[PDB]
Design a protein around this ligand. Structure first.
Ligand SMILES: [Zn+2]
Ligand SMILES: [Zn+2]
Lengths: 123, 120
């Protein structure tokens, strides 16, 4: 049986929860990415932060990008699948949260990221 | 079918002198990821996306309460443009949103999804 572990992009960097929104923006530019998994110490997943979140939940909400943190916003977007999750389970989570990307966890730690495109390649 | 038939007419246009924070608020308000930027009398100056604010704004060290949409700001179609013509512009600029102009003024916005839902 195919699992998230089989399909995921293993070993991605999880940005620190205390990083400011400005630092997260710099990170998104530096690494040409728009969705970041945010973690507490030891890669403990706290949620996902997108470029749009910074604008909508950050700037649009009157938050200061130089003081508000990635963790404060990512906590509003917590969802994931276990490394042993099936393709159907991953699709169910994506559907429920209206996203095409989902973090993969194993023993409370982020171990990878799975996208619909990844699933598509493993059918 | 023309752009005028498919567009969301009279959508908000962020003024060139409005700040990035103001633009962000419009994006939340209308739940959209891109807004046309206008000079006087609805004259189109360009488009601003949410990622633009993050990458060309915050990542560049600019203050969103100071920097304006105009400073981060070209493509569009006439209101009589065909679907084929609209798709050409979207493919050339690699975008899913396009400003519609008529008599030198912005009159609306057309999205790729708009075209899809308007096809019989
Ligand atoms: Zn219509
Ligand atoms: Zn062009």
């Amino acid at each position: 049986m195919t699992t998230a572990r089989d399909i995921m992009n293993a070993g991605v960097t999880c940005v620190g929860e205390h990083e400011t929104l400005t630092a997260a923006a710099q990170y998104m530019r530096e690494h040409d990415i728009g969705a970041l998994p945010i973690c507490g110490d030891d890669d403990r997943l706290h949620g996902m932060l997108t470029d749009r979140d910074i604008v909508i939940k950050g700037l649009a909400a009157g938050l200061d990008p130089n003081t508000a943190t990635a963790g404060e916003l990512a906590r509003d977007s917590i969802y994931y699948v276990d490394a042993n999750a099936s393709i159907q389970e991953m699709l169910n989570v994506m559907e429920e949260h209206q996203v095409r990307r989902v973090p993969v966890i194993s023993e409370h730690r982020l171990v990878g990221i799975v996208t619909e495109a990844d699933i598509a390649r493993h059918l």
